[PDB]
Amino acid sequence: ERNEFPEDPEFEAVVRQAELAIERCIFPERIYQSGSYFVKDPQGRIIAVFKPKNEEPYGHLNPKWTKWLQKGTGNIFEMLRIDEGLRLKIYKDTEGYYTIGIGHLLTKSPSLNAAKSELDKAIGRNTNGVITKDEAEKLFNQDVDAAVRGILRNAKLKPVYDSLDAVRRAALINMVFQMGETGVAGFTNSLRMLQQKRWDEAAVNLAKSRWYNQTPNRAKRVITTFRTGTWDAYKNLGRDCLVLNQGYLSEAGASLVDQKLELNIVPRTKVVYLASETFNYSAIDRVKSRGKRNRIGLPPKVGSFQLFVEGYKDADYWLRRFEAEPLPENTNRQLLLQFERLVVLDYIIRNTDRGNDNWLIKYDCDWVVVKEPVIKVAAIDNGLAFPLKHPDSWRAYPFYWAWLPQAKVPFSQEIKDLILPKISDPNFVKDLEEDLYELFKKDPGFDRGQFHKQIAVMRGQILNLTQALKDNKSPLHLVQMPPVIVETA
Ligand SMILES: Nc1ncnc2c1ncn2[C@@H]1O[C@H](COP(=O)(O)OP(=O)(O)OP(=O)(O)O)[C@@H](O)[C@H]1O
Ligand SMILES: Nc1ncnc2c1ncn2[C@@H]1O[C@H](COP(=O)(O)OP(=O)(O)OP(=O)(O)O)[C@@H](O)[C@H]1O
Ligand SMILES: [Ca+2]
Ligand SMILES: [Ca+2]
To answer: Does the active-site annotation cover 19?
Structure first.
């Protein structure tokens, strides 16, 4: 609640100006180019980027999913479209029964002619197994009504149904849609627990059936729907190596890793609580804000707070110009030294999303002070890192800078002198795991099981990076090393 950071007085000062700006009604404006805002000072100057947890792509208050929110059982349509898909020609389901459109069962007969007959009757014309999308939607609407009708007609199903919330009702409709009224009623045990609100208890013994066994992926989506009562199971059906809704922790974790490695390319990021009318709040929070305690106001949202850096442009922008009109050797070397730090950071944390759009470059054209560098790099948008595992398809989530010509240059001695003494030291790696733990555990949805996997991947990255640095490998040869995890038994 209290954004205090004795370790970092400049950062705490920047946060204070953000709080003061909000009080004077200079609110952070939405970046929108979804859950990110340009935090400003009282003078209107942008001072940081803020990304609240509940507004992330998986966030419950994500403005992108709010449409889904109000509809609610009305989402059974889109829910079933995701589970059933669309096919304009007759096909066999998992049970081997003829089907068409959006999961519309035609018959249990092995005869394709009997199926075509049932189809012609349903559509009202000679289709020969082929229908249009509109015809599929019509049948789909009918099948949905029939599923609801079967529910409300049944004596065993109705009691469980009206006692359920809007979201959990769609889950029951889903089962009735797939198995029918008679079949779903056969789940006497699971139906009772659902009635008594015993969500976890029910989600367990629901997996104890041919339904789960026959179609596990579908069952898992529907069961978790019964468990959590949200639409999370249908938010991102591709497969994900990243944990659910912890992007802010990834943004902060990236800064933590960078600082301990002394990389200094990630603008300082930390977990910060902010309240702002410009943010997306629930209706219940909006109404209560105008109560009298001075008003109660809006609850401060938790999220990642990252300091804004000035003078930078897209890495794509600068790499573009450099490719055309190459930098002088001395400047290009400075650029390469920065690139190496970016490579080390992304590999250790395993950033899945680091295109030339996710890092910035600042190009500016006998003593006790070091002469200032002409070029500098900033690693931004580090919300999609610290994966639970290596991606099933590296092509889907690759290190994009690996395809850059800079990635072919061998690791300099300077980057070796900086990193090797740290990661090769098991005491350093242990403390790093500890710091990440204290940061990650703060999250309510924190899973100790997930964390051990995140660390196993990181330790696997450190293993390859250590040897790659010793062998003077380039970043490209580094990524080409077979990904591995160091798991504890
Ligand atoms: N620390 C920073 N300093 C300066 N500019 C920044 C910083 N972070 C982000 N920006 C600017 O804000 C833009 C968007 O930020 P970011 O990518 O983090 O937002 P996002 O919500 O993740 O959006 P996207 O969908 O593009 O990833 C960047 O293109 C960059 O121009
Ligand atoms: N841009 C990248 N991002 C992440 N990993 C990469 C990248 N490029 C190469 N690799 C890793 O290096 C290994 C060898 O890459 P290579 O260019 O030989 O592809 P490949 O072996 O032809 O394709 P496949 O990985 O399907 O065997 C891959 O298994 C991959 O894990
Ligand atoms: Ca981005
Ligand atoms: Ca992003």
So the answer is: no
| Pocket lining: 199 vs ligand 1, CB cutoff 6 Å | no
Indicate which ligand has the atom closest to the C-alpha of 392.
2
Domain boundaries, the chain: 9-63+268-307, 66-234, 313-479
Q: Greatest CA span in the chain, whole angstroms? A: 95
Best residue for ligand 2 mutational test, from 394, 404, 478 (most atoms within 8 Å of Cβ): 394
Distance set, CA 400 to CA 133, 292, 328, 350 (Å):
39, 52, 25, 12
- DSSP for residue 479: H
143 is catalytic: no
**What values do phi and psi take at 321, rounded to 5?**
-65, -35
Q: Whose CA is nearest to atom 2 of ligand 1?
A: 308
DSSP 300-341: PEEEEEEE--SS-EEHHHHHHHHHHSPPPHHHHHHHHHHHHH
Going from the C-alpha of 360 to that of each of 187, 245, 315, the distances in angstroms are 56, 25, 5
Nearest to 139 by CA among 162, 151, 121: 121
Question: Considering the domain 66-234 in this protein, what is its CATH number?
Answer: 1.10.530.40
Copy the structure tokens of residue 225: 């729907």
127 lines ligand 1 (CB under 6 A): no
Task: Return the CATH number of 313-479, one of 3.10.450, 1.10.1070, 2.60.40, 2.40.50.
Answer: 1.10.1070
Measured from the CB, is residue 402 less than 6 Å from ligand 2? yes
Contact 364, 374 (CB under 8 A): yes
